[PDB]
Amino acid sequence: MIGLVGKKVGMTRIFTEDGVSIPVTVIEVEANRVTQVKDLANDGYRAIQVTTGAKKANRVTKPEAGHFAKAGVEAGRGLWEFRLAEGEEFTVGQSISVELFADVKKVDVTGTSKGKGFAGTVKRWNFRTQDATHGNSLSHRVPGSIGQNQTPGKVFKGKKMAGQMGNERVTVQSLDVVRVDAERNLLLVKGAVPGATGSDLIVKPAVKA
Amino acid sequence: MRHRKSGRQLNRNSSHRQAMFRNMAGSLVRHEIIKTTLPKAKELRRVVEPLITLAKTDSVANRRLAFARTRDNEIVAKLFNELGPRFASRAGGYTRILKCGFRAGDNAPMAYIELVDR
Amino acid sequence: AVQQNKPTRSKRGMRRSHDALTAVTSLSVDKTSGEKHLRHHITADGYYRGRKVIAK
Amino acid sequence: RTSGAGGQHVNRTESAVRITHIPTGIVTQCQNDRSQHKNKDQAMKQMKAKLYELEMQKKNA
Amino acid sequence: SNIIKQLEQEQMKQDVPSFRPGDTVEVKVWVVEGSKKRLQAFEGVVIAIRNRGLHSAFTVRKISNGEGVERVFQTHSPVVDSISVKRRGAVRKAKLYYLRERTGKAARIKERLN
Amino acid sequence: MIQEQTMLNVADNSGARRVMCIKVLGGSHRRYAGVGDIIKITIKEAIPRGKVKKGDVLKAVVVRTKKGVRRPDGSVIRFDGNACVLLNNNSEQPIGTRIFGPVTRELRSEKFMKIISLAPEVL
RNA sequence: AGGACCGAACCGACUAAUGUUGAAAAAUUAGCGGAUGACUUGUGGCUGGGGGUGAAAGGCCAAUCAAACCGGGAGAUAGCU
RNA sequence: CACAGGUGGUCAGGUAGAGAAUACCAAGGCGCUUGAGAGAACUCGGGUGAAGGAACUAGGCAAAAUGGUGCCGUAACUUC
RNA sequence: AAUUCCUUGUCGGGUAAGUUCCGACCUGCACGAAUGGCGUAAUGAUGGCCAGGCUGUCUCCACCCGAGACUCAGUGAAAUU
RNA sequence: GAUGUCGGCUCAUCACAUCCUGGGGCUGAAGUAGGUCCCAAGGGUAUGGCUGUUCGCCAUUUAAAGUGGUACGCGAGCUGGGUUUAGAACGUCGUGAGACAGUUCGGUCCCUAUCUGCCGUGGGCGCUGGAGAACUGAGGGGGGCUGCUCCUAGUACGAGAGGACCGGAGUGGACGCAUCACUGGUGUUCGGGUUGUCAUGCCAAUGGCACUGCCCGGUAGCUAAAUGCGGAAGAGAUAAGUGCUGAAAGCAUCUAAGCACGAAACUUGCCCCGAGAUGAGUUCUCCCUGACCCUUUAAGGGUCCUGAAGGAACGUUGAAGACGACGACGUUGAUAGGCCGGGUGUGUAAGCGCAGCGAUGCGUUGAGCUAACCGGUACUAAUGAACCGUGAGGCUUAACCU
Ligand SMILES: [K+]
Ligand SMILES: [K+]
Ligand SMILES: [K+]
Ligand SMILES: [K+]
Ligand SMILES: [K+]
Ligand SMILES: [K+]
Ligand SMILES: [K+]
Ligand SMILES: [K+]
Ligand SMILES: [K+]
Ligand SMILES: [K+]
Ligand SMILES: [K+]
């Protein structure tokens, strides 16, 4: 099935009557308007492009404005695409609400993880630090060796080194759908999802199942 | 990482920052306009303006609090006798910052910071 | 660590290909004094956005 | 490698030999000579001597 | 934000009594064994309170069968059936963590008699 | 949160006074043992006429930890010391006949019913 | 009383880290030993190189020591590069 | 070298302190001749740390810990 | 054994486990009586082993405060080739 | 005219002669549990005692504690216990200086990365008018481990003891990703206690310094020990192996023709990157419809006029960030500061009054103060402009209108 685009509101807990605290992420899923429908004849694949939220009229550029106007929908804060199964079918201008997940048990949530910046090997790849004492010289959190001798005489590709960590697309799979609140446009999922508060999330029905 | 953290270190330790901002707040209250570096002015807002908000309400407790913040009775008296009444109706933003080029000695970005009713 | 071979003037110029300065795009003109100034900065005469902000 | 190996050669070469008799568990070891072959021969002699000594001890018992 | 605050207000309890660090309290909690569900009483001194709305908690310390036990209750948890203040303690700190090093007479807390 | 070299008190009357964890059983590279976990212990101090002697190696089940246990609602129960109950190497049944101090609900298993029944108080 | 004890100046130099194109051709920081004695220090003097001096390490004799430095024999000699 | 070194003598305030230790001060003298930012890895010098507590390592290296005064009391062994 | 090759000798102690340590044994490769033997209180920045305390030494790292590293303006090396 | 070494540490990478997990054949294979060989390299594959140790023995685990290559990988990564200088001693040898694959105690480990390589991050141009978006997926990477319990079932098997295959469910260990609701750490930017001293004339109340002087708590953020999730199922083609039909060879025969099964290996399925994929792809939308002059006369050069879509720059900034970059916002505005209200933390401020000889207590009073938090608020700063980017976009051939 297709997914929806929501916003990470924060984390909370739900107390069940049998004394269990469920940690939940709150995802504000407002109405997603279909701005374009792609098919085999014109695009070679079946998908829908959706938008959500609102945008400044003076910060919508004329190309974006025309693309929205052809669909006849209000300008959202972005455009996302969802592939279509052969049964699913939508029309341009149709709005999709969080009710789509009313009967969905598990979801996959994708978001841009929080950026850590330039991270060292210890943080980024869980390398073990060298000894803090016992004579160690300036080499407490350094990577250590990065290869063998003359053979091969080079460093292999994909070597685990320091560099940019986080701020990338991350998907968490098979999260329970705790609650679907249509009137408040809320999806309460069990557990933690990638990204900071106020980030965009893509919520799809679980592919693993 | 410094996610959601406020305050500029300004290449100084904590006590030095506190003393420097106390002195700079005294100077700004005394002269009503000073020329400093742009980051220092942007940090001085967050120190001086609460002093004026405090001076809006005149009481012995508030006067002693202002003295503790800025250990100078002249600055305390000027605050509570002029700046409070001057800015009584103004909600916030008792200061404005005007960027004014670069320092000759080290190419540091400079700015005047002044009281808005000067 | 140090070079095994002397780098060339060609390589030196290639490295310095990114060292070029960028001139200020344009200067703003004060609405009152007509003086040119850096945008969002006061003029040499103490004007900003048509107002005499600093005397002298 | 032999203990207290002194020099690049000795540190690098595997000269010490240890022989273990699996049925009995008795172990002999030789590392006196620079040659692994000589050490193995001497350890074999010691292993034969130890097995013979064990059998003689049983007979004397 | 407002959304989360609403989601928490609709869950928070309404009859939580007022207690302060140093008070002796009895907390009746639901114990479920097999199929039978009963109440177990944990009585002791409140040594820490965390006011965080729905996420409020409090730590109670007792000396049970010669061993010191600390239990951290989530205030709005359904498992916490009841809280009652048996004695009002007079302390000057918000967190009485120094009581962990004191036993017997040294651990006595003066009663807040007003 | 018991690991190797951790010293524990004994919550039973088997005669031991102090034991030391020498292995956290139940998995390769397993680090810690909480309440309800079985460890291999050596006896460091014992009473003169106990059922166990100093230097013996046997098993134990951890019944109290300073790190404590966590309940489904987020509550945490912590104790002031780490205490275990000794068990035979083979049967893994308790050696002593009395249990001292409270134990937790985490022992509510057909394996530790003797400990649960003998405990003065179950939390 | 004491080649007594504790501990600053003072004299040293046991450990670690730093520094190693150094702040420094031997140091800094935190500790460490002695601290009325076979102690330490200022000024001046004497011992000279197969010589001195050495509570002795082949140590020291001007950042030089299993024979100082400077000048000379001298363009020593070099079946070696 | 306008160098974190070396360099003999003399003078010797207050409060706390046994003290020429140490802390804060006086008289007096200085802020150490590049600054401005930012607040990544990593290095250096510090602070704190759940549970554990030498499992580290060649080795408790390092760190932590102890630390004053008065009184009570203090073992083997001893050349007393 | 500052001495013992074989050798991690054997036995006892200590540890869950001890090539080290301590106590014996004597089979002293290759101790031994002023290039002294064997003891020995006190002393030692002396070597080995053990215990208590204590801890980021470690399980296994986390955060924070500063000096650098990074950017801007001024000055402006080095080895090497 | 110098290729630094044993062991350890950190980080590995490949082989397969496979240790575990996977598949199979035979068994002196009843079952359980093994033996042995064949296929299989996807993942996984201990902590300690002793020793400088490699090795090894021992203790206790594990599904298992593989065997190797990589300058016996890895010192311009660390260490420096062993080795290996100069001091010194023992045994021993030598008359002696000295010596010992004998031992013993002590004993300086430099290098600011030019190139390749690798991890990240930009600038330029290209992709054939320019521009803003959304994609496709050639290709590349990541991931892939396993225990125990229960049901099947005390069933099959077995004289008993014991005890399954196949299939299903639950719950763990290790590992990885994310996150901070909870439990905690930190929190020299918040509150308080307190020692010494100095100052604010003094009292009182405060400030400075003493490691944040020492401490006790603690917001936001970051974070693990905290808590969510993952490894798969399925599909295709196979390995060893098992077969079906079937001659050559009237029988037999898994094979020669033909057909079917068959594993953590392969290829997909899952996650991420990804059109410089120069083979530079696709879709949607937006913008530009002036004149004139020369020449060597063409994908030619001017001249004037015009300056779009958009971009950049600047400023306020950000859970984005070394700098670039990326994101939000710029008065038609909540981007930052302030302010307001709340929250949170600390713990009942000052001043006054009362009680007490006084230290101090009580009342006012849960007071005061409160960072980064939440909800609001144009008070301050985000200035009109200017700058870059053009003027309908080559040739040939088709198809269609024409
Ligand atoms: K200058
Ligand atoms: K001479
Ligand atoms: K001897
Ligand atoms: K003699
Ligand atoms: K000694
Ligand atoms: K197998
Ligand atoms: K088999
Ligand atoms: K494999
Ligand atoms: K060996
Ligand atoms: K290997
Ligand atoms: K090299």
Ligand SMILES: [K+]
């Ligand atoms: K090269």
Ligand SMILES: [K+]
């Ligand atoms: K948290």
Ligand SMILES: [K+]
């Ligand atoms: K926190």
Ligand SMILES: [K+]
């Ligand atoms: K003070």
Ligand SMILES: [K+]
């Ligand atoms: K056949």
Ligand SMILES: [K+]
């Ligand atoms: K492209």
Ligand SMILES: [K+]
């Ligand atoms: K604001």
Ligand SMILES: [K+]
């Ligand atoms: K009061």
Ligand SMILES: [K+]
């Ligand atoms: K008061």
Ligand SMILES: [K+]
């Ligand atoms: K309050």
Ligand SMILES: [Mg+2]
């Ligand atoms: Mg970030």
Ligand SMILES: [Mg+2]
């Ligand atoms: Mg060094």
Ligand SMILES: [Mg+2]
């Ligand atoms: Mg270091």
Ligand SMILES: [Mg+2]
């Ligand atoms: Mg902020």
Ligand SMILES: [Mg+2]
């Ligand atoms: Mg600086």
Ligand SMILES: [Mg+2]
């Ligand atoms: Mg450059």
